[PDB]
Design a protein around this ligand. Structure first.
Ligand code: HEM
Ligand SMILES: [Fe+2]
Length: 434
């Protein structure tokens, strides 16, 4: 036989620990660490997950070559979402020189989103931010003209796509279950929306964006090179990594601000003061806004949108006396690691001061403060994501005041899917400032 790695307790349901991973993934990953240590395992259906935690194990995880731990085929639930379509058999839109423009675009999207708010009212954070980020992502990554042809429908269907990521995907992403069925219908709904837009552009051409370019590409015969399914597949793929992440992070940032009015007041004074120089959001969102940035960092430590990072071992490796065999699913968890007691004093408390100049607990714990991951695969959209949070709230916090419309403890995440979403209701009251 072979040496067995430590295995966390429980996991006696039909698919081992899968059932528990769906109902309470963080509790399960935490128990793995509490019982096994830096290297423990749990069963996800027919796959064994080697969960790593702590600086040393995380370092190995984040510094391993794309040839040692494969990120491909690690997230089987994504295949049906992107589709088989192939256009060209992130980088561009994310170049620094483009940031200024995106910041201006984001400010515009926010103002348009709150345009009808009036003096006072209420909103649900998930509905608001999920939709807002569809508009920010599509406008910045695909084009403003394209976004102007999008409405709440695109948002709703994209949400359905994200919800079609049940852990059962590790059994088979095409299992005949409701969430997967809705997933497929939603994607077809998305393709139809794009097809309608394409037809509208054919009928009355511009007097141009990415869609216009793609629409104009043709094969020999003269027939259009790309179908609506292929283009949609690409657009979906381009917006996925930054949607649910920015959406959730935006909601939690506001939630923590309302939960901690002293930090909220600090941020307000800061914003009012900084923008007193008369420079635009496109200027300030790309520069230092310390109080808000520290609130964001702490929000990300406590509420990382990706609670688990997956890889597929392509060989045999040794991590702290433990053997990883090729074929094993190897994982790291920002959820668990970001709260390691030793690395972050009072890990369960919201303390943006951790990131202040003299403390910088984020830079000090290079292998455990991992909301954006680390190493070679560190989130490439990190700078954009931070800029977006800066731009969104520079507008929101200066225009309106926000208060929780439900118990502070009632705001929570839904972890029933691999793609974490804020749970509803998430009711918040707003009222114009000044
Ligand atoms: C503040 C919100 C965000 C958080 C917390 C976040 C977090 C992460 C994490 C933890 C990873 C690593 C996954 C792994 O190691 O397997 C990642 C990867 C990635 N993220 Fe984000 N992200 C955010 C926003 C965004 C945005 C807005 C974009 C696009 C504009 C984006 C694009 C990407 C891409 C393309 C990757 C893959 C990098 C690679 O493997 O080369 N992210 N992100
Ligand atoms: Fe509400």
């Amino acid at each position: 036989s072979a040496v067995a790695l430590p295995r966390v307790s429980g996991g006696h349901d039909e698919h081992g620990h899968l059932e528990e991973f769906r109902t309470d993934p963080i509790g399960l990953m935490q128990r793995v660490r509490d019982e096994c240590g830096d290297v423990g395992t749990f069963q996800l259906a027919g796959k064994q997950v080697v969960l790593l935690s702590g600086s040393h194990a995380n370092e190995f995880f984040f510094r391993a070559g794309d040839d040692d731990l494969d990120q491909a085929k690690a997230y089987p639930f994504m295949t049906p979402i992107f589709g088989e379509g192939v256009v060209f058999d992130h980088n561009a839109a994310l170049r620094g020189e483009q940031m200024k423009g995106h910041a201006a675009t984001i400010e515009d999207q926010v103002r348009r989103m709150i345009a009808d708010w009036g003096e006072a009212g209420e909103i649900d954070l998930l509905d608001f931010f999920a939709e807002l980020t569809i508009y920010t992502s599509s406008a910045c990554l695909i084009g403003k003209k394209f976004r102007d042809q999008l409405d709440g429908r695109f948002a709703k269907l994209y949400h359905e796509l994200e919800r079609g990521t049940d852990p059962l995907a590790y059994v088979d992403p095409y299992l005949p279950i409701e969430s997967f069925r809705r997933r497929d219908e939603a994607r077809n709904g998305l393709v139809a929306l794009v097809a309608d837009i394409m037809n509208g552009r054919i009928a009355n051409p511009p007097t141009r964006d990415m869609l216009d370019v793609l629409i104009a590409v043709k094969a020999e015969t003269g027939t259009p090179r790309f179908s609506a399914d292929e283009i949609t597949g690409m657009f979906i793929s381009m917006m996925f990594a930054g949607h649910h992440t920015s959406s959730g992070t935006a909601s939690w940032t506001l939630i923590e601000l309302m939960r901690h009015r002293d930090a909220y007041a600090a941020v307000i004074d800061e914003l009012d003061e900084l923008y007193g120089d008369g420079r635009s959001v496109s200027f300030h969102a790309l520069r230092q806004i310390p109080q808000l940035e520290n609130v964001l960092k702490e929000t990300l430590r406590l509420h990382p949108p990706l609670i688990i990072l997956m890889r597929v071992a392509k060989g045999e490796f040794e991590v702290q006396g433990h053997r990883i065999h090729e074929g094993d699913l190897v994982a790291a968890s920002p959820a668990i690691s970001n709260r390691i007691p030793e690395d972050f004093p009072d890990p369960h408390d919201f303390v943006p001061a951790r990131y202040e100049q003299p403390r910088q607990e984020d830079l000090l714990n290079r292998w455990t403060w991992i909301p954006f991951g680390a190493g070679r695969h560190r989130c490439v959209g990190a700078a954009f994501a931070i800029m977006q949070i800066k731009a969104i709230f520079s507008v929101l916090l200066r225009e309106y005041e926000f208060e929780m419309a439900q118990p502070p403890e009632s705001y929570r995440n839904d972890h029933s899917k691999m793609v974490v979403q804020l749970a509803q209701p998430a009711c918040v009251r707003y009222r114009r400032r000044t």
